[PDB]
């Protein structure tokens, strides 16, 4: 049956044009692609696993699109935040994220990135308690994380290191997926309390009594006051070798840094891009705080880079670092959406009809995207480009013998006359 597909997308348009909010269209597009992603995946020829991934990718694209256009377009401007110098860093961070939309967009994108991150299954047969093997062998004179740093790593039993590897890798995957809470649960329950405490340092300080404007979200102070310190402390910890590469990787991510080579070598376009947006973000916040004298000089223990990249440039670098992935045509759209250069690329792939034809999803996707765009933002895509796009997709509805659902697509030109 699967050669139903076009119907599904077409179907959504019917429903929209017939209940005369348009963001639902896209939401449905997402679900549609996702549903299809499941079909080709379950039981299939290994020729299907490829086009299955091109559907999952499809789906993620619709999601990213929803998220960003919702934020950008459903922009109805709220009330400005009036801080005082007595206010906590927590509030300044919040203000920053309110006022600066360019940067919040980065947040949105990172959220999306996390959303779609793979995490291994929870490690089984995890041991009763930490470093149990070394303790049992004798020779651990102190039971604290810093003991084998104080003197040769030869102290720790092999099996203990191996388990620490399992743990830190799992925690890292959880952190990249945004699963910070699950990471704290794992830390707690796997007898890694100190690592947990480290993970608690992620929050900026807020106090409900002083920072009135969040006396709703909180009843008790939380987060840590000397954060610039925390951050250098973590970064330094991250650079200290004789630690597992995933642990160092974790601290790298937390400090707004770029994890060690041993770990970074396995990160893909999405993962890598995520890492570097994280860096942009971290740097931008800390600079925002410095520009408002909310950092205390004592805390500037160490040099961290102060110069934030632009999303343009991060994308550019990650691109040259992951060419295969980068060049994939829906991931190009992903970037195009991220930078807002989206009608730009529509008109572009339009002229590529004048190796877009070789890949099937593309001509569809661009067309439906163009439709959505002009629905949500009338004027968005040039009248001509709509004409050209629908023209060509329609002639494929003909080649598939689904003339049945052509009128729906007609509802966008007087050129429709000619059908």
């Amino acid at each position: 049956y699967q050669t139903e597909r076009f119907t599904k997308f077409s179907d959504t348009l019917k429903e929209f044009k017939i209940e005369q909010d348009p963001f639902n269209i896209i939401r449905e597009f997402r679900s549609a692609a996702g549903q299809l992603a499941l079909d080709l995946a379950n039981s299939g020829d290994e020729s299907n696993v490829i086009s299955s991934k091109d559907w999952e990718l499809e789906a993620r694209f619709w999601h990213l699109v929803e998220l960003l256009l919702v934020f950008r377009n459903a922009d109805l401007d709220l009330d400005e935040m009036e801080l005082h110098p007595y206010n906590s860093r927590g509030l300044f961070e919040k203000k920053l994220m309110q006022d600066n939309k360019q940067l919040y967009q980065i947040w949105i994108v990172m959220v999306w990135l996390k959303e779609n991150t793979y995490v291994m299954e929870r490690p089984k047969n995890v041991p009763t308690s930490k470093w149990l093997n070394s303790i049992t062998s004798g020779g651990l004179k102190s039971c604290d994380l810093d003991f084998p740093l104080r003197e040769n790593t030869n102290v720790l039993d092999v099996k203990d290191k191996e388990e620490d590897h399992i743990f830190f890798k799992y925690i890292y995957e959880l952190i990249l997926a945004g699963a910070i809470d699950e990471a704290l649960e794992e830390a707690k329950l796997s007898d890694n309390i100190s690592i947990c405490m480290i993970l608690c340092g992620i929050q900026e300080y807020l106090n409900p009594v002083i920072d009135t404007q969040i006396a709703n979200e909180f009843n008790t102070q939380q987060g840590i006051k000397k954060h610039s310190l925390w951050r250098r402390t973590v970064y330094s910890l991250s650079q200290q070798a004789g630690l597992d590469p995933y642990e160092r990787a974790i601290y790298s991510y937390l400090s707004g840094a770029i994890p060690n080579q041993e770990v970074l070598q396995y990160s893909d376009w999405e993962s890598d891009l995520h890492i570097h947006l994280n860096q942009i973000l971290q740097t931008e916040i800390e600079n925002y705080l410095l520009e408002n004298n909310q950092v205390g000089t004592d805390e500037l223990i160490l040099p961290l880079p102060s110069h934030a990249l632009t999303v343009q440039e991060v994308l550019n670098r990650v691109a040259s670092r992951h060419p295969s992935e980068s060049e994939h045509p829906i991931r190009v759209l992903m970037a195009s959406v991220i930078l807002d250069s989206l009608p730009s690329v529509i008109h572009s792939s339009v002229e590529m009809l004048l190796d877009i034809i070789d890949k099937p999803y593309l001509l569809r996707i661009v067309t439906h995207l163009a439709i959505c765009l002009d629905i949500i933002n009338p004027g968005s895509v040039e009248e001509v480009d709509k004409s050209k796009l629908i023209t060509t997709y329609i002639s494929l509805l003909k080649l598939q013998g689904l003339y049945e659902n052509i009128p729906i697509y007609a509802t966008f030109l007087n050129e429709s006359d000619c059908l």
Binding site: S142, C143, D144, I224, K226, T233, S236, Q240
Partner: protein, 186 residues
């Protein structure tokens, strides 16, 4: 001097200000005592602790960093934020050690106890330091870490005094007692 959105915030800021001045002053007093002690220590982690005794979180953190105690270093940076998560986590770690825990360094435990927010009030207690430090120094410990936000300055100081008899004849002691006694100063 600066204007405040509402008046309970003002009250809160005034509390912070007073607290900061009191604790800067205590550090002024205990200063040479502790600096002497740091002079004579032969152990780095103990020095880190003493730096916490002078309410210098940053130099402690720095020495930690330098002495290859990095995790500790991270933990230290929390001292003086009253994050109840960290408080209960630190206490938990302390119980786990104090139930088996074949061996934990004597000063690392002290530092964790400081993170616990109740360094004498406790089950890994710094109360025995009664015999090694000026009463004022330990009071500094309660006042700086101790649980600043949930308590008023008075009932906090009172909390500390409830754990330690001060010498009858000592007048700066007397003033703390009169301050904490609040409801019945007279």
């Amino acid at each position: 001097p600066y204007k405040t959105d509402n008046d309970q915030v003002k009250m809160a800021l005034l509390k912070k200000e007073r607290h900061c001045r009191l604790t800067s002053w205590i550090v002024s007093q205990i200063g040479p005592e502790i600096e002497e002690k740091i002079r004579n220590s032969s152990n780095e982690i103990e020095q880190i602790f003493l730096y916490l005794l002078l309410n210098d979180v940053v130099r402690a953190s720095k020495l930690a960093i330098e002495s290859k105690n990095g995790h500790l270093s991270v933990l230290i940076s929390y001292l003086g934020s009253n994050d109840p998560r960290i408080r209960d986590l630190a206490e938990l770690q302390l119980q786990k050690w104090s139930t088996g825990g074949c061996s934990i360094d004597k000063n690392i435990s002290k530092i964790y106890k400081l993170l616990s927010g109740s360094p004498f009030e406790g089950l890994f207690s710094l109360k025995e330091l009664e015999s090694e430090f000026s009463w004022l120094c330990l009071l500094n410990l309660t006042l700086c870490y101790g649980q600043i936000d949930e308590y008023s300055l008075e009932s906090l100081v009172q909390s500390h005094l409830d754990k330690f008899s001060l010498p009858y004849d000592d007048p700066i002691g007397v003033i703390f007692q009169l301050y904490a006694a609040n409801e019945n100063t007279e």
